[PDB]
Amino acid sequence: KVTQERMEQIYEEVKTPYKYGLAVAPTDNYHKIDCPTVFRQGDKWLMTYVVYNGKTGTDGRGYETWIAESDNLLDWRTLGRVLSYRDGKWDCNQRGGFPALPDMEWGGSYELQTYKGRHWMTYIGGEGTGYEAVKAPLFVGLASTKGDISTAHEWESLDKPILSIHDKDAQWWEKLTQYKSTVYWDKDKTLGAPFVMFYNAGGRHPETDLKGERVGIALSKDMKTWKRYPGNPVFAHEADGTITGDAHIQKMGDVYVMFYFSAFEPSRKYKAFNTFAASYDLVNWTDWHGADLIIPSKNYDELFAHKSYVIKHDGVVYHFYCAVNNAEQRGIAIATSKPMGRSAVRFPKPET
């Protein structure tokens, strides 16, 4: 267990009280933008994000992954797609990606690392249309590129998922569908493998029959072949329909900090939010006992303020998150550790 004192120090280190506002927003009501991953190459900042091209649960085709660039972490310009609808394949309708092998050092380079001369990415893949898993389940895919990661070009992908709910070795907590994943390079082989995947998935608890989304680990020596951690899930909050997910891990000294979101948690009077946990061993997680890091509080995030990517750079913490309002407009916003101005980006006028 991480001490209360150390948990309080981590909170003071990572907090972002000051909402800059939207970073990336849809220009109409029939697109939704989510799932930031921020990284650096040279002195350019890059963000991958997913786009759903519908207003409702069923009108859109599904996820594509786009990339945007920035010089200052605040002002962003969209470049184009990096994972597009892939006709004739298992993932033809859902392609929502999450770059892999980030430098995990808190306040470090924020670069993506190479393996076998390539950059890597995992993704939400599936053949159902609509929003996420409404028509069909979602599985974990693997992508990679030998290209320049600062360019909107198509990354290459496998013709089978790397993990799926139908696998012989699939566990109870992931039987319904898989959701976000992120693969880390663990130099220390803390869990007996160099590649450690943190992912969230839906299932039913074998004792209580409660449905929810929970976080677990998968392990690999080559990016291609994966085994589940036998002790999965490693982080969950047990209530009816509660979501725990989008685990985002950075190493701060001798401790790992997991930024995560939760939704439909009974102990909160807002519907979705970000907080953190910490661990020395990647498996046993101590939950923060204080105020949540990001909560609904502005027009633009009044329903959900949730999902994390966190950059500490030049003495300032930038917490990227997905903002959803009561009209269910969806985009990516930023909060910071000191005021950094105000975004000029707005959502479109909502539909009546």
Short mmCIF file of N, CA, C and O in Angstrom, two decimals, residues 78-211:
data_model
loop_
_atom_site.label_atom_id
_atom_site.label_comp_id
_atom_site.label_asym_id
_atom_site.label_seq_id
_atom_site.Cartn_x
_atom_site.Cartn_y
_atom_site.Cartn_z
N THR A 78 -5.29 19.75 -36.91
CA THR A 78 -5.52 18.36 -37.39
C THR A 78 -4.87 18.15 -38.72
O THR A 78 -4.99 19.03 -39.62
N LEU A 79 -4.14 17.03 -38.84
CA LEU A 79 -3.38 16.73 -40.05
C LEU A 79 -4.07 15.75 -40.99
O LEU A 79 -3.88 15.86 -42.21
N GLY A 80 -4.85 14.81 -40.44
CA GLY A 80 -5.49 13.75 -41.25
C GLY A 80 -5.44 12.46 -40.48
O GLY A 80 -4.96 12.41 -39.35
N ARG A 81 -5.94 11.42 -41.16
CA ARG A 81 -6.07 10.08 -40.57
C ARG A 81 -4.77 9.28 -40.50
O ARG A 81 -3.90 9.37 -41.39
N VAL A 82 -4.66 8.50 -39.41
CA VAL A 82 -3.61 7.48 -39.28
C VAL A 82 -4.14 6.05 -39.23
O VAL A 82 -3.36 5.12 -39.45
N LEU A 83 -5.43 5.88 -38.93
CA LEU A 83 -6.12 4.53 -38.93
C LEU A 83 -7.50 4.76 -39.49
O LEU A 83 -8.35 5.39 -38.84
N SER A 84 -7.72 4.27 -40.71
CA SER A 84 -8.94 4.54 -41.46
C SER A 84 -9.78 3.26 -41.53
O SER A 84 -9.25 2.17 -41.38
N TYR A 85 -11.06 3.41 -41.88
CA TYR A 85 -11.94 2.28 -42.12
C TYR A 85 -11.27 1.36 -43.13
O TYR A 85 -10.84 1.80 -44.20
N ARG A 86 -11.22 0.08 -42.79
CA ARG A 86 -10.42 -0.86 -43.49
C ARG A 86 -11.33 -1.97 -44.11
O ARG A 86 -11.57 -3.05 -43.51
N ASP A 87 -11.85 -1.67 -45.30
CA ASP A 87 -12.85 -2.55 -45.96
C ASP A 87 -12.32 -3.96 -46.19
O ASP A 87 -11.17 -4.15 -46.63
N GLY A 88 -13.15 -4.97 -45.90
CA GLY A 88 -12.78 -6.36 -46.12
C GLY A 88 -12.00 -7.03 -45.00
O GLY A 88 -11.62 -8.20 -45.16
N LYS A 89 -11.79 -6.33 -43.88
CA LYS A 89 -11.02 -6.84 -42.76
C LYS A 89 -11.89 -6.89 -41.49
O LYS A 89 -12.98 -6.36 -41.47
N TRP A 90 -11.36 -7.53 -40.45
CA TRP A 90 -12.06 -7.75 -39.16
C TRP A 90 -12.44 -6.46 -38.45
O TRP A 90 -13.37 -6.41 -37.67
N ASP A 91 -11.67 -5.43 -38.73
CA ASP A 91 -11.83 -4.13 -38.10
C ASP A 91 -12.39 -3.10 -39.09
O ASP A 91 -12.03 -1.93 -39.03
N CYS A 92 -13.23 -3.51 -40.03
CA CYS A 92 -13.62 -2.60 -41.12
C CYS A 92 -14.34 -1.34 -40.66
O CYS A 92 -14.17 -0.29 -41.28
N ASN A 93 -15.08 -1.40 -39.55
CA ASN A 93 -15.94 -0.29 -39.08
C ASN A 93 -15.47 0.45 -37.81
O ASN A 93 -15.92 1.57 -37.56
N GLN A 94 -14.54 -0.14 -37.05
CA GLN A 94 -14.02 0.46 -35.81
C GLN A 94 -12.51 0.38 -35.78
O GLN A 94 -11.95 -0.71 -35.84
N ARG A 95 -11.86 1.56 -35.78
CA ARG A 95 -10.41 1.68 -35.86
C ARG A 95 -9.98 2.79 -34.91
O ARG A 95 -9.68 3.92 -35.36
N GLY A 96 -9.94 2.53 -33.60
CA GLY A 96 -9.65 3.59 -32.61
C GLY A 96 -8.34 3.33 -31.90
O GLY A 96 -8.27 2.54 -30.97
N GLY A 97 -7.30 4.12 -32.20
CA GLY A 97 -5.94 3.79 -31.83
C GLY A 97 -5.25 4.55 -30.72
O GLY A 97 -5.58 5.74 -30.44
N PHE A 98 -4.23 3.90 -30.13
CA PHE A 98 -3.55 4.34 -28.94
C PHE A 98 -2.06 4.01 -29.11
O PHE A 98 -1.60 2.88 -28.96
N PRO A 99 -1.25 4.99 -29.48
CA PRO A 99 0.15 4.67 -29.62
C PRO A 99 0.75 3.92 -28.43
O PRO A 99 0.29 4.06 -27.28
N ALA A 100 1.77 3.12 -28.74
CA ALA A 100 2.41 2.24 -27.79
C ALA A 100 3.84 2.60 -27.51
O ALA A 100 4.46 3.41 -28.23
N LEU A 101 4.35 2.05 -26.44
CA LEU A 101 5.69 2.18 -25.99
C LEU A 101 6.07 3.66 -25.71
O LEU A 101 7.16 4.11 -26.09
N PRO A 102 5.18 4.38 -25.00
CA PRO A 102 5.54 5.76 -24.65
C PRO A 102 6.68 5.75 -23.61
O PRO A 102 6.72 4.83 -22.78
N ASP A 103 7.54 6.77 -23.62
CA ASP A 103 8.42 7.03 -22.50
C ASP A 103 7.48 7.32 -21.31
O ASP A 103 6.66 8.23 -21.36
N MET A 104 7.59 6.49 -20.27
CA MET A 104 6.72 6.56 -19.10
C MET A 104 7.18 7.53 -18.05
O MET A 104 6.46 7.80 -17.09
N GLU A 105 8.40 8.03 -18.19
CA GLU A 105 8.95 8.96 -17.19
C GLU A 105 8.08 10.23 -17.02
O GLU A 105 7.93 11.03 -17.97
N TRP A 106 7.51 10.40 -15.83
CA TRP A 106 6.82 11.63 -15.44
C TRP A 106 7.73 12.85 -15.66
O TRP A 106 8.83 12.94 -15.12
N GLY A 107 7.24 13.76 -16.47
CA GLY A 107 8.01 14.94 -16.85
C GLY A 107 9.25 14.68 -17.71
O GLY A 107 10.17 15.50 -17.76
N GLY A 108 9.26 13.56 -18.42
CA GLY A 108 10.41 13.19 -19.23
C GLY A 108 10.23 13.58 -20.68
O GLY A 108 9.60 14.61 -20.99
N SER A 109 10.76 12.76 -21.58
CA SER A 109 10.84 13.13 -22.98
C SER A 109 9.50 13.22 -23.68
O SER A 109 9.34 13.99 -24.62
N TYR A 110 8.56 12.36 -23.25
CA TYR A 110 7.25 12.14 -23.89
C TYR A 110 7.34 11.62 -25.31
O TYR A 110 6.39 11.72 -26.09
N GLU A 111 8.47 11.00 -25.61
CA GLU A 111 8.68 10.41 -26.92
C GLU A 111 8.05 9.00 -26.91
O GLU A 111 7.83 8.39 -25.85
N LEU A 112 7.72 8.53 -28.10
CA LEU A 112 7.36 7.14 -28.35
C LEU A 112 8.63 6.39 -28.68
O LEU A 112 9.51 6.92 -29.34
N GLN A 113 8.74 5.15 -28.21
CA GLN A 113 9.95 4.38 -28.40
C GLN A 113 9.75 3.42 -29.56
O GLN A 113 8.62 3.04 -29.88
N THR A 114 10.85 3.07 -30.21
CA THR A 114 10.82 2.09 -31.29
C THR A 114 11.22 0.70 -30.81
O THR A 114 11.95 0.52 -29.81
N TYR A 115 10.75 -0.28 -31.56
CA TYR A 115 11.09 -1.68 -31.36
C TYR A 115 11.12 -2.31 -32.76
O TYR A 115 10.17 -2.15 -33.53
N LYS A 116 12.24 -2.96 -33.08
CA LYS A 116 12.48 -3.58 -34.38
C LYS A 116 12.33 -2.56 -35.51
O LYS A 116 11.82 -2.86 -36.59
N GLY A 117 12.79 -1.34 -35.22
CA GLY A 117 12.80 -0.26 -36.18
C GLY A 117 11.46 0.37 -36.47
O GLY A 117 11.36 1.16 -37.41
N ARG A 118 10.43 0.03 -35.69
CA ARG A 118 9.09 0.52 -35.92
C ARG A 118 8.54 1.20 -34.69
O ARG A 118 8.96 0.90 -33.57
N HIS A 119 7.58 2.10 -34.91
CA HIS A 119 6.68 2.58 -33.86
C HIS A 119 5.42 1.73 -33.88
O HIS A 119 5.03 1.18 -34.92
N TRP A 120 4.82 1.58 -32.70
CA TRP A 120 3.70 0.63 -32.51
C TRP A 120 2.49 1.33 -31.91
O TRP A 120 2.59 2.41 -31.34
N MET A 121 1.34 0.69 -32.08
CA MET A 121 0.04 1.20 -31.63
C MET A 121 -0.88 0.03 -31.42
O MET A 121 -0.82 -0.94 -32.17
N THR A 122 -1.71 0.10 -30.39
CA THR A 122 -2.83 -0.82 -30.26
C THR A 122 -4.10 -0.06 -30.48
O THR A 122 -4.14 1.15 -30.38
N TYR A 123 -5.18 -0.77 -30.76
CA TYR A 123 -6.45 -0.15 -31.11
C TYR A 123 -7.71 -0.96 -30.76
O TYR A 123 -7.68 -2.22 -30.60
N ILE A 124 -8.80 -0.23 -30.59
CA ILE A 124 -10.18 -0.78 -30.55
C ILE A 124 -10.54 -1.12 -31.99
O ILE A 124 -10.58 -0.21 -32.86
N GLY A 125 -10.79 -2.41 -32.27
CA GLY A 125 -11.16 -2.85 -33.59
C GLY A 125 -12.45 -3.63 -33.59
O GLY A 125 -12.77 -4.27 -32.59
N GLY A 126 -13.21 -3.59 -34.68
CA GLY A 126 -14.47 -4.32 -34.75
C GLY A 126 -15.16 -4.13 -36.08
O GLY A 126 -14.81 -3.24 -36.86
N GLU A 127 -16.14 -4.98 -36.34
CA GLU A 127 -16.88 -4.95 -37.57
C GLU A 127 -18.29 -4.39 -37.44
O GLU A 127 -18.95 -4.20 -38.45
N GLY A 128 -18.74 -4.06 -36.22
CA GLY A 128 -20.06 -3.46 -36.03
C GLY A 128 -20.05 -1.97 -36.27
O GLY A 128 -19.04 -1.30 -36.03
N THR A 129 -21.17 -1.45 -36.76
CA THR A 129 -21.30 -0.01 -36.95
C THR A 129 -21.81 0.59 -35.63
O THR A 129 -21.97 -0.13 -34.61
N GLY A 130 -22.16 1.86 -35.66
CA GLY A 130 -22.58 2.56 -34.46
C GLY A 130 -21.45 2.91 -33.52
O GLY A 130 -20.24 2.85 -33.86
N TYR A 131 -21.87 3.37 -32.35
CA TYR A 131 -20.94 3.78 -31.31
C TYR A 131 -20.41 2.57 -30.51
O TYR A 131 -21.18 1.88 -29.83
N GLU A 132 -19.11 2.37 -30.58
CA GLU A 132 -18.39 1.33 -29.86
C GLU A 132 -19.01 -0.05 -30.11
O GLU A 132 -19.09 -0.46 -31.26
N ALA A 133 -19.49 -0.71 -29.05
CA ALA A 133 -19.89 -2.10 -29.12
C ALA A 133 -21.39 -2.28 -29.28
O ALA A 133 -21.89 -3.36 -29.05
N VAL A 134 -22.11 -1.25 -29.69
CA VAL A 134 -23.58 -1.36 -29.80
C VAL A 134 -24.09 -2.44 -30.80
O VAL A 134 -25.13 -3.04 -30.55
N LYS A 135 -23.39 -2.64 -31.92
CA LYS A 135 -23.77 -3.66 -32.94
C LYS A 135 -22.97 -4.96 -32.91
O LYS A 135 -23.45 -5.99 -33.40
N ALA A 136 -21.78 -4.91 -32.34
CA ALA A 136 -20.87 -6.05 -32.30
C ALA A 136 -19.77 -5.75 -31.31
O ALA A 136 -19.47 -4.60 -31.05
N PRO A 137 -19.10 -6.78 -30.80
CA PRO A 137 -18.03 -6.56 -29.83
C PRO A 137 -16.78 -5.89 -30.41
O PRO A 137 -16.57 -5.84 -31.64
N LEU A 138 -15.95 -5.38 -29.51
CA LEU A 138 -14.67 -4.78 -29.90
C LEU A 138 -13.50 -5.59 -29.34
O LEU A 138 -13.60 -6.15 -28.23
N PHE A 139 -12.47 -5.77 -30.16
CA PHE A 139 -11.30 -6.56 -29.81
C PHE A 139 -10.05 -5.69 -29.91
O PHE A 139 -10.09 -4.65 -30.58
N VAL A 140 -8.94 -6.12 -29.30
CA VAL A 140 -7.66 -5.38 -29.36
C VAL A 140 -6.88 -5.69 -30.63
O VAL A 140 -6.40 -6.77 -30.86
N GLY A 141 -6.65 -4.68 -31.46
CA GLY A 141 -5.78 -4.82 -32.61
C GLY A 141 -4.37 -4.24 -32.41
O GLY A 141 -4.11 -3.53 -31.45
N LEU A 142 -3.48 -4.60 -33.32
CA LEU A 142 -2.08 -4.17 -33.29
C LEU A 142 -1.74 -3.49 -34.61
O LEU A 142 -2.07 -4.03 -35.68
N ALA A 143 -1.11 -2.33 -34.52
CA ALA A 143 -0.62 -1.60 -35.68
C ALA A 143 0.78 -1.16 -35.48
O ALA A 143 1.26 -1.08 -34.35
N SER A 144 1.43 -0.82 -36.59
CA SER A 144 2.79 -0.34 -36.55
C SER A 144 3.13 0.45 -37.79
O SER A 144 2.41 0.40 -38.78
N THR A 145 4.21 1.21 -37.71
CA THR A 145 4.69 1.96 -38.88
C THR A 145 6.20 2.14 -38.86
O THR A 145 6.80 2.25 -37.79
N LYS A 146 6.80 2.12 -40.05
CA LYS A 146 8.19 2.52 -40.24
C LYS A 146 8.25 4.00 -40.69
O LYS A 146 9.34 4.55 -40.92
N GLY A 147 7.08 4.62 -40.84
CA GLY A 147 7.02 6.02 -41.29
C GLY A 147 7.30 7.06 -40.23
O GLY A 147 7.55 6.74 -39.06
N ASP A 148 7.21 8.31 -40.66
CA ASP A 148 7.35 9.43 -39.78
C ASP A 148 6.04 9.64 -39.01
O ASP A 148 5.02 10.03 -39.59
N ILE A 149 6.09 9.41 -37.69
CA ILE A 149 4.89 9.47 -36.82
C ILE A 149 4.25 10.86 -36.69
O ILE A 149 3.10 10.98 -36.24
N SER A 150 4.98 11.89 -37.13
CA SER A 150 4.43 13.26 -37.20
C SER A 150 3.60 13.57 -38.46
O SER A 150 3.18 14.72 -38.63
N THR A 151 3.39 12.56 -39.33
CA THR A 151 2.64 12.70 -40.57
C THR A 151 1.36 11.89 -40.56
O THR A 151 1.28 10.83 -39.92
N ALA A 152 0.34 12.41 -41.23
CA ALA A 152 -0.95 11.73 -41.35
C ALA A 152 -0.78 10.76 -42.51
O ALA A 152 -1.06 11.11 -43.65
N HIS A 153 -0.29 9.57 -42.18
CA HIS A 153 -0.21 8.43 -43.08
C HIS A 153 -0.79 7.24 -42.36
O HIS A 153 -0.88 7.22 -41.13
N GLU A 154 -1.15 6.23 -43.14
CA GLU A 154 -1.80 5.01 -42.60
C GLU A 154 -0.76 4.07 -41.97
O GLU A 154 0.19 3.64 -42.61
N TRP A 155 -0.99 3.72 -40.71
CA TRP A 155 -0.17 2.73 -40.04
C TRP A 155 -0.67 1.34 -40.51
O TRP A 155 -1.78 1.21 -40.96
N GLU A 156 0.22 0.37 -40.51
CA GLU A 156 -0.08 -1.00 -40.94
C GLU A 156 -0.66 -1.79 -39.80
O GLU A 156 -0.28 -1.63 -38.66
N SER A 157 -1.58 -2.67 -40.14
CA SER A 157 -2.22 -3.48 -39.10
C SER A 157 -2.35 -4.95 -39.45
O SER A 157 -2.29 -5.35 -40.62
N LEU A 158 -2.46 -5.73 -38.38
CA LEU A 158 -2.64 -7.21 -38.51
C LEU A 158 -4.03 -7.59 -38.97
O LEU A 158 -5.02 -6.91 -38.69
N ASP A 159 -4.12 -8.75 -39.62
CA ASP A 159 -5.38 -9.21 -40.17
C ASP A 159 -6.26 -10.03 -39.20
O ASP A 159 -7.33 -10.50 -39.60
N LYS A 160 -5.80 -10.12 -37.95
CA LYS A 160 -6.47 -10.72 -36.82
C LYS A 160 -6.24 -9.81 -35.61
O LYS A 160 -5.19 -9.16 -35.51
N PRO A 161 -7.21 -9.77 -34.66
CA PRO A 161 -6.88 -9.10 -33.41
C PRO A 161 -5.74 -9.80 -32.68
O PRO A 161 -5.51 -11.00 -32.89
N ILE A 162 -5.07 -9.09 -31.79
CA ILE A 162 -4.08 -9.70 -30.89
C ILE A 162 -4.68 -10.24 -29.59
O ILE A 162 -4.12 -11.17 -29.00
N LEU A 163 -5.80 -9.67 -29.15
CA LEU A 163 -6.60 -10.23 -28.07
C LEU A 163 -8.04 -10.13 -28.49
O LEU A 163 -8.46 -9.17 -29.13
N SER A 164 -8.84 -11.08 -28.05
CA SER A 164 -10.25 -11.06 -28.39
C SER A 164 -10.98 -11.75 -27.26
O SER A 164 -10.36 -12.49 -26.49
N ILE A 165 -12.29 -11.49 -27.18
CA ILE A 165 -13.19 -12.12 -26.16
C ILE A 165 -13.43 -13.65 -26.36
O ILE A 165 -13.87 -14.32 -25.44
N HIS A 166 -13.19 -14.10 -27.59
CA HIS A 166 -13.34 -15.47 -28.05
C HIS A 166 -12.11 -16.31 -27.85
O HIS A 166 -12.18 -17.53 -28.05
N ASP A 167 -11.01 -15.73 -27.40
CA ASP A 167 -9.82 -16.51 -27.11
C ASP A 167 -10.10 -17.59 -26.03
O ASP A 167 -10.88 -17.37 -25.11
N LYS A 168 -9.43 -18.73 -26.15
CA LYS A 168 -9.51 -19.85 -25.18
C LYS A 168 -9.14 -19.39 -23.78
O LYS A 168 -9.70 -19.84 -22.81
N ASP A 169 -8.18 -18.46 -23.72
CA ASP A 169 -7.64 -17.94 -22.46
C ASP A 169 -8.26 -16.61 -22.00
O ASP A 169 -7.77 -16.02 -21.04
N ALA A 170 -9.35 -16.17 -22.64
CA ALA A 170 -10.09 -14.99 -22.17
C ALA A 170 -10.69 -15.22 -20.78
O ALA A 170 -11.18 -16.32 -20.48
N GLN A 171 -10.63 -14.18 -19.96
CA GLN A 171 -11.07 -14.23 -18.57
C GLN A 171 -12.44 -13.57 -18.37
O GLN A 171 -12.95 -12.85 -19.26
N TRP A 172 -13.07 -13.83 -17.21
CA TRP A 172 -14.43 -13.34 -16.96
C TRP A 172 -14.63 -11.83 -17.19
O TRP A 172 -15.64 -11.42 -17.73
N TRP A 173 -13.65 -11.06 -16.76
CA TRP A 173 -13.75 -9.59 -16.77
C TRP A 173 -13.71 -8.91 -18.13
O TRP A 173 -13.96 -7.70 -18.23
N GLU A 174 -13.41 -9.68 -19.17
CA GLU A 174 -13.26 -9.17 -20.54
C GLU A 174 -14.16 -9.93 -21.53
O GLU A 174 -13.96 -9.83 -22.70
N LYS A 175 -15.12 -10.74 -21.06
CA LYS A 175 -15.96 -11.57 -21.98
C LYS A 175 -16.93 -10.82 -22.87
O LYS A 175 -17.28 -11.34 -23.91
N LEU A 176 -17.35 -9.61 -22.48
CA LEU A 176 -18.36 -8.86 -23.23
C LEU A 176 -17.77 -8.10 -24.44
O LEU A 176 -18.30 -8.13 -25.54
N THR A 177 -16.65 -7.43 -24.20
CA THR A 177 -16.00 -6.61 -25.23
C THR A 177 -14.74 -6.06 -24.59
O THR A 177 -14.66 -5.91 -23.38
N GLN A 178 -13.76 -5.79 -25.43
CA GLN A 178 -12.57 -5.08 -25.00
C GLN A 178 -12.72 -3.62 -25.37
O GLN A 178 -13.51 -3.27 -26.25
N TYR A 179 -12.05 -2.78 -24.61
CA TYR A 179 -12.09 -1.35 -24.90
C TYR A 179 -10.62 -0.81 -25.04
O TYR A 179 -9.81 -1.44 -25.76
N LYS A 180 -10.28 0.32 -24.41
CA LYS A 180 -8.92 0.93 -24.62
C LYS A 180 -7.83 -0.01 -24.11
O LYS A 180 -8.11 -0.79 -23.17
N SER A 181 -6.67 -0.02 -24.77
CA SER A 181 -5.44 -0.68 -24.36
C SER A 181 -4.26 0.26 -24.53
O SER A 181 -4.32 1.20 -25.33
N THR A 182 -3.19 0.03 -23.79
CA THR A 182 -1.90 0.75 -24.01
C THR A 182 -0.82 -0.23 -23.63
O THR A 182 -0.94 -0.91 -22.59
N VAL A 183 0.16 -0.41 -24.49
CA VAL A 183 1.29 -1.30 -24.23
C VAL A 183 2.51 -0.50 -23.82
O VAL A 183 2.90 0.48 -24.50
N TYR A 184 3.13 -0.90 -22.72
CA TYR A 184 4.34 -0.28 -22.16
C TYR A 184 5.56 -1.18 -22.37
O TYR A 184 5.42 -2.39 -22.32
N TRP A 185 6.74 -0.58 -22.59
CA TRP A 185 8.01 -1.30 -22.57
C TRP A 185 8.52 -1.27 -21.12
O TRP A 185 8.82 -0.21 -20.61
N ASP A 186 8.53 -2.41 -20.45
CA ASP A 186 9.04 -2.52 -19.08
C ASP A 186 10.45 -3.09 -19.15
O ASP A 186 10.63 -4.29 -19.26
N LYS A 187 11.45 -2.22 -19.11
CA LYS A 187 12.86 -2.63 -19.12
C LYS A 187 13.18 -3.63 -18.00
O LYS A 187 13.92 -4.60 -18.20
N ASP A 188 12.58 -3.39 -16.85
CA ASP A 188 12.83 -4.22 -15.67
C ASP A 188 12.13 -5.59 -15.67
O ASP A 188 12.40 -6.39 -14.79
N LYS A 189 11.26 -5.88 -16.65
CA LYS A 189 10.52 -7.15 -16.72
C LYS A 189 9.90 -7.53 -15.37
O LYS A 189 9.97 -8.70 -14.89
N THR A 190 9.26 -6.53 -14.77
CA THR A 190 8.59 -6.59 -13.47
C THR A 190 7.60 -7.74 -13.34
O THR A 190 7.40 -8.24 -12.22
N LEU A 191 6.95 -8.11 -14.47
CA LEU A 191 5.96 -9.19 -14.55
C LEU A 191 6.38 -10.35 -15.49
O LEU A 191 5.55 -11.16 -15.93
N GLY A 192 7.69 -10.43 -15.74
CA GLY A 192 8.31 -11.50 -16.51
C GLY A 192 8.26 -11.34 -18.02
O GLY A 192 8.53 -12.29 -18.75
N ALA A 193 7.94 -10.13 -18.49
CA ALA A 193 7.87 -9.86 -19.91
C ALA A 193 8.24 -8.40 -20.17
O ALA A 193 7.93 -7.53 -19.32
N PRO A 194 8.86 -8.12 -21.32
CA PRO A 194 9.19 -6.73 -21.64
C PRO A 194 7.99 -5.88 -22.04
O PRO A 194 8.08 -4.65 -21.92
N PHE A 195 6.90 -6.50 -22.53
CA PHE A 195 5.74 -5.72 -23.01
C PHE A 195 4.53 -5.98 -22.12
O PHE A 195 4.09 -7.11 -21.97
N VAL A 196 4.04 -4.90 -21.53
CA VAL A 196 2.95 -4.95 -20.58
C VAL A 196 1.78 -4.14 -21.04
O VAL A 196 1.92 -2.94 -21.16
N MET A 197 0.65 -4.75 -21.29
CA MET A 197 -0.54 -4.10 -21.73
C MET A 197 -1.51 -3.88 -20.62
O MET A 197 -1.81 -4.78 -19.90
N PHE A 198 -1.99 -2.64 -20.45
CA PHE A 198 -2.99 -2.27 -19.53
C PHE A 198 -4.22 -2.00 -20.41
O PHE A 198 -4.21 -1.30 -21.34
N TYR A 199 -5.31 -2.71 -20.13
CA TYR A 199 -6.54 -2.55 -20.92
C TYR A 199 -7.79 -2.72 -20.09
O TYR A 199 -7.77 -3.38 -19.05
N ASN A 200 -8.86 -2.06 -20.52
CA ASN A 200 -10.16 -2.20 -19.85
C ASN A 200 -11.14 -2.94 -20.77
O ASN A 200 -10.99 -3.01 -21.97
N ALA A 201 -12.07 -3.64 -20.13
CA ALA A 201 -12.97 -4.54 -20.83
C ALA A 201 -14.20 -4.70 -19.97
O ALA A 201 -14.14 -4.39 -18.81
N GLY A 202 -15.31 -5.16 -20.57
CA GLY A 202 -16.57 -5.39 -19.88
C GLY A 202 -16.77 -6.88 -19.57
O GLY A 202 -16.43 -7.71 -20.36
N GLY A 203 -17.29 -7.15 -18.39
CA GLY A 203 -17.66 -8.50 -17.97
C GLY A 203 -18.51 -8.46 -16.73
O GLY A 203 -18.84 -7.41 -16.19
N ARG A 204 -18.84 -9.67 -16.27
CA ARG A 204 -19.70 -9.82 -15.12
C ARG A 204 -18.93 -10.50 -14.01
O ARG A 204 -18.32 -11.57 -14.21
N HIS A 205 -19.10 -10.02 -12.80
CA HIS A 205 -18.29 -10.50 -11.68
C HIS A 205 -18.84 -11.90 -11.31
O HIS A 205 -20.05 -12.07 -11.25
N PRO A 206 -17.94 -12.88 -11.12
CA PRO A 206 -18.44 -14.27 -10.92
C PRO A 206 -19.14 -14.46 -9.60
O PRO A 206 -19.91 -15.38 -9.45
N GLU A 207 -18.82 -13.68 -8.59
CA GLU A 207 -19.57 -13.72 -7.30
C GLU A 207 -20.89 -12.95 -7.25
O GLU A 207 -21.87 -13.48 -6.76
N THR A 208 -20.93 -11.71 -7.76
CA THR A 208 -22.07 -10.83 -7.62
C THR A 208 -22.95 -10.70 -8.84
O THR A 208 -24.07 -10.19 -8.74
N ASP A 209 -22.47 -11.18 -9.98
CA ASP A 209 -23.13 -11.03 -11.27
C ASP A 209 -23.29 -9.57 -11.72
O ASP A 209 -24.07 -9.29 -12.63
N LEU A 210 -22.51 -8.67 -11.12
CA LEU A 210 -22.53 -7.26 -11.50
C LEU A 210 -21.72 -7.05 -12.77
O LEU A 210 -20.54 -7.44 -12.85
N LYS A 211 -22.37 -6.43 -13.75
CA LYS A 211 -21.71 -5.98 -14.97
C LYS A 211 -20.95 -4.68 -14.71
O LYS A 211 -21.42 -3.80 -13.96
#
